[PDB]
Design a protein around this motif. Structure first.
Motif, mmCIF file in Angstrom:
data_model
loop_
_atom_site.group_PDB
_atom_site.id
_atom_site.type_symbol
_atom_site.label_atom_id
_atom_site.label_comp_id
_atom_site.label_asym_id
_atom_site.label_seq_id
_atom_site.Cartn_x
_atom_site.Cartn_y
_atom_site.Cartn_z
ATOM 1 N N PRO A 41 30.290 25.403 -40.430
ATOM 2 C CA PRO A 41 30.337 24.977 -39.021
ATOM 3 C C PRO A 41 28.945 24.688 -38.434
ATOM 4 C CG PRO A 41 31.736 26.878 -39.404
ATOM 5 C CD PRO A 41 30.865 26.747 -40.594
ATOM 6 N N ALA A 42 27.891 25.197 -39.093
ATOM 7 C CA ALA A 42 26.517 24.947 -38.642
ATOM 8 C C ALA A 42 25.850 23.782 -39.334
ATOM 9 C CB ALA A 42 25.658 26.203 -38.801
ATOM 10 N N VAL A 43 26.592 23.038 -40.147
ATOM 11 C CA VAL A 43 25.943 22.002 -40.933
ATOM 12 C C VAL A 43 26.054 20.686 -40.147
ATOM 13 C CG1 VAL A 43 26.047 20.494 -42.967
ATOM 14 C CG2 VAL A 43 26.368 23.058 -43.193
ATOM 15 N N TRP A 44 24.953 19.958 -40.048
ATOM 16 C CA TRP A 44 24.921 18.682 -39.358
ATOM 17 C C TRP A 44 24.447 17.594 -40.307
ATOM 18 C CZ3 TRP A 44 20.749 15.418 -38.968
ATOM 19 C CH2 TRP A 44 20.740 14.409 -37.987
ATOM 20 N N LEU A 85 13.110 29.293 -32.536
ATOM 21 C CA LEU A 85 14.080 28.228 -32.370
ATOM 22 C C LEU A 85 15.180 28.765 -31.452
ATOM 23 C CD1 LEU A 85 15.041 25.423 -33.458
ATOM 24 C CD2 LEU A 85 16.575 26.694 -35.049
ATOM 25 N N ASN A 86 15.542 30.026 -31.655
ATOM 26 C CA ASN A 86 16.638 30.564 -30.885
ATOM 27 C C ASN A 86 16.316 30.712 -29.399
ATOM 28 O OD1 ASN A 86 19.398 31.578 -30.805
ATOM 29 N ND2 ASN A 86 18.437 33.498 -30.235
ATOM 30 N N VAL A 87 15.067 31.019 -29.056
ATOM 31 C CA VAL A 87 14.694 31.106 -27.627
ATOM 32 C C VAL A 87 14.202 29.744 -27.066
ATOM 33 C CG1 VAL A 87 14.289 33.623 -27.779
ATOM 34 C CG2 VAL A 87 12.381 31.991 -28.188
ATOM 35 N N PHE A 135 20.039 34.973 -41.443
ATOM 36 C CA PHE A 135 19.784 36.100 -40.547
ATOM 37 C C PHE A 135 19.916 35.680 -39.099
ATOM 38 C CE2 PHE A 135 18.079 39.978 -42.751
ATOM 39 C CZ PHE A 135 18.464 39.576 -44.029
ATOM 40 N N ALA A 136 19.407 34.510 -38.738
ATOM 41 C CA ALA A 136 19.529 34.007 -37.356
ATOM 42 C C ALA A 136 21.002 33.819 -36.977
ATOM 43 C CB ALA A 136 18.765 32.680 -37.206
ATOM 44 N N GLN A 137 21.786 33.205 -37.876
ATOM 45 C CA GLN A 137 23.223 33.035 -37.659
ATOM 46 C C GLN A 137 23.929 34.360 -37.481
ATOM 47 O OE1 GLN A 137 23.999 29.993 -40.999
ATOM 48 N NE2 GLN A 137 25.571 29.604 -39.460
ATOM 49 N N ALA A 138 23.606 35.314 -38.353
ATOM 50 C CA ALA A 138 24.194 36.622 -38.269
ATOM 51 C C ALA A 138 23.925 37.242 -36.896
ATOM 52 C CB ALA A 138 23.668 37.507 -39.374
ATOM 53 N N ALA A 139 22.758 36.933 -36.335
ATOM 54 C CA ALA A 139 22.322 37.551 -35.091
ATOM 55 C C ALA A 139 22.911 36.795 -33.905
ATOM 56 C CB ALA A 139 20.815 37.581 -35.027
ATOM 57 N N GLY A 140 23.691 35.747 -34.178
ATOM 58 C CA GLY A 140 24.298 34.931 -33.130
ATOM 59 C C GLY A 140 23.609 33.625 -32.762
ATOM 60 N N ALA A 141 22.641 33.182 -33.570
ATOM 61 C CA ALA A 141 21.960 31.885 -33.347
ATOM 62 C C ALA A 141 22.923 30.725 -33.574
ATOM 63 C CB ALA A 141 20.731 31.729 -34.275
ATOM 64 N N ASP A 142 22.989 29.811 -32.613
ATOM 65 C CA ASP A 142 23.885 28.654 -32.731
ATOM 66 C C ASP A 142 23.092 27.454 -33.278
ATOM 67 O OD1 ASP A 142 26.040 26.889 -32.599
ATOM 68 O OD2 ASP A 142 25.943 26.554 -30.447
ATOM 69 N N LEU A 143 22.439 27.634 -34.416
ATOM 70 C CA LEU A 143 21.570 26.609 -34.969
ATOM 71 C C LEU A 143 22.357 25.609 -35.802
ATOM 72 C CD1 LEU A 143 21.475 27.277 -38.185
ATOM 73 C CD2 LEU A 143 19.869 29.081 -37.474
ATOM 74 N N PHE A 188 15.779 22.430 -43.011
ATOM 75 C CA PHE A 188 15.296 22.148 -41.678
ATOM 76 C C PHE A 188 16.353 22.544 -40.705
ATOM 77 C CE2 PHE A 188 11.072 20.535 -41.353
ATOM 78 C CZ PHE A 188 10.739 20.411 -42.732
ATOM 79 N N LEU A 189 15.987 23.374 -39.735
ATOM 80 C CA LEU A 189 16.957 23.842 -38.749
ATOM 81 C C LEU A 189 16.708 23.213 -37.385
ATOM 82 C CD1 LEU A 189 18.584 25.591 -40.599
ATOM 83 C CD2 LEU A 189 16.248 26.504 -40.765
ATOM 84 N N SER A 190 17.784 22.965 -36.649
ATOM 85 C CA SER A 190 17.640 22.407 -35.319
ATOM 86 C C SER A 190 18.412 23.194 -34.299
ATOM 87 C CB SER A 190 18.130 20.959 -35.275
ATOM 88 O OG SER A 190 17.824 20.364 -34.019
ATOM 89 N N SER A 191 17.970 23.077 -33.049
ATOM 90 C CA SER A 191 18.795 23.557 -31.972
ATOM 91 C C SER A 191 19.984 22.586 -31.962
ATOM 92 C CB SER A 191 18.004 23.564 -30.664
ATOM 93 O OG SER A 191 18.428 22.554 -29.780
#
Length: 291
Positions: free
Chosen positions: A284-287, A51-53, A68-76, A190-193
């Motif tokens: 801040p990542a919740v939609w 998702l991140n790439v 883990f993705a958020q921690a790594a800088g994912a803007d999901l 469910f995660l989104s870009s």
């Protein structure tokens, strides 16, 4: 009203409702102007990496991979919540093992997918016996690879989920040492870009609506779902049926306040336990879509 030309949606075969949504072409039926492309991932962190790439723009995972993705800088974005299925989150030991309690895991080699729900399961269950992640030796392995390691006798325990739980306990490979019951597990998401959900909010909401309905197949179409799932997975019907037994309904729905706070608490716990390199802010990542 415009819809995207394509949805590359990640899924894990362990999620029976997605396998069925795929097989029954539910999204295709609902979205005839969108190319629906299901992309399978071995587990959550893999799906998140994709998702991140930008390999997918939507996908389901456990609670832990997006942290883990958020921690790594994912803007999901978190766009949907899946209720937990704690009976299906398990620590298994080889059935030949003398391990019989969680306490016996001290100093043992435990396979699990790093940053998956299993990571949290292990942390939480270990903690109840006064064991932390530093008291065991992790073997960070994808499900298939952990399964091979477990078969080869290289692991003392394996934190894993269905269908592996059902498969290995039913064929005599494994004993259940502990499941996720009593832990207040959050469930999954469910995660989104962020770009996709911002561009196509209504669509993403409707996708969730359709996936939400898919989960119902397990109950309202039990015997057909078992047949289909067994057929698609190559799993014995008996194994499939056991995976359904371990699940209550778990349909994707909007994140509630308590869910988001629970996810933050998990973020905080992972940080406190030195399992994440950054403190993760969930809110801040919740939609949620308008309406």
């Amino acid at each position: 009203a415009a819809e995207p030309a394509q949805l590359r949606i990640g899924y894990q075969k362990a999620v029976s409702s997605l396998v069925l949504a795929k097989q029954h072409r539910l999204l295709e039926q609902r979205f005839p102007r969108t190319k629906i492309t299901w992309v399978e991932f071995p587990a959550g962190p893999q799906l998140l990496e994709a998702l991140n790439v930008g390999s997918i723009d939507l996908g389901g995972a456990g609670d832990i991979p997006p942290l883990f993705a958020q921690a790594a800088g994912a803007d999901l974005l978190y766009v949907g919540w899946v209720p937990p299925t704690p009976k299906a989150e398990t620590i298994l030991v080889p059935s030949k093992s003398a391990l019989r309690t969680v306490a016996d895991l001290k100093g043992k080699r435990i396979a699990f997918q790093k940053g998956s729900s299993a990571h949290n399961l292990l942390l939480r269950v270990l903690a109840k016996s006064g064991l932390s992640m530093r008291d065991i030796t992790p073997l960070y392995l994808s499900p298939a690879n952990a399964r091979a390691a477990f078969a080869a006798g290289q692991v003392d325990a394996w934190a894993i989920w269905d269908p592996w739980y059902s498969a290995l306990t039913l064929d005599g490979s494994a004993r259940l040492l502990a499941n996720g019951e009593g832990l207040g597990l959050t469930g999954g998401f469910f995660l989104s870009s962020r770009r996709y959900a911002t561009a196509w909010g209504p669509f993403v909401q409707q996708v969730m609506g359709t996936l939400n309905q898919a989960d119902g197949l397990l109950e309202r179409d039990r015997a057909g779902s078992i047949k289909t799932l067994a057929q698609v997975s190559g799993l014995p019907p008996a194994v499939v049926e056991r995976t359904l037994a371990h699940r209550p309904p778990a349909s994707v729905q909007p994140l509630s306040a308590q869910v988001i706070k629970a996810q933050q608490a998990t973020a905080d716990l992972f940080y406190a336990q030195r399992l994440l390199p950054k403190r993760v802010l969930v809110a801040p990542a919740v939609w949620r879509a308008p309406d």
